[PDB]
Design a binder for this molecule. Structure first.
Ligand SMILES: [Ca+2]
Ligand SMILES: [Ca+2]
Ligand SMILES: [Ca+2]
Length: 134
């Protein structure tokens, strides 16, 4: 199952893993490794980017590595016929000094809309997005 492999790689690379006991898993990626790993997840068969959620930790009581984070919902869709239903979240922290991430619109077509919603809401730039060049 793809999710086993995702977690094995995260453990080996020292990327933080989080669970909520309800079957939801998070892998925290450093911004410097984000695009390479997203491309690897696509190659592994996470063919559906379901969602991107922007987060602002300003005013919440527990310190985080950065003010902002972006969360991606990746899915291996159970169908034709590889694809096993694996689903997990990627979280990447984004510095307030440089609120910027690589686009993944080259990997998933749903990213066009999802990234634009986050840019409009938080001002986080998805560099390379067809609407956000320059
Ligand atoms: Ca969902
Ligand atoms: Ca969702
Ligand atoms: Ca959503």
């Amino acid at each position: 199952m793809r999710l086993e492999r995702v977690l094995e790689e995260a453990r080996a690379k020292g990327y933080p893993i989080e669970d909520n006991g309800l079957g939801n898993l998070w892998v925290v990626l450093p911004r410097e490794r984000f695009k390479e790993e997203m491309a690897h997840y696509k190659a592994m068969g996470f063919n559906f980017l379901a969602d991107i959620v922007g987060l602002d930790y300003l005013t919440y009581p527990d310190p985080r590595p950065e003010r902002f984070a972006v969360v991606y919902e990746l899915v291996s869709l159970p169908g034709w016929k590889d694809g096993d239903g694996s689903r997990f979240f990627v979280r990447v922290y984004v510095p307030e000094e440089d609120p910027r991430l690589p686009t993944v619109t080259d990997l998933w077509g749903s990213a066009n809309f999802l990234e634009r919603e986050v840019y409009d809401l938080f001002g986080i730039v998805f560099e390379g997005h067809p609407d956000l060049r320059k």
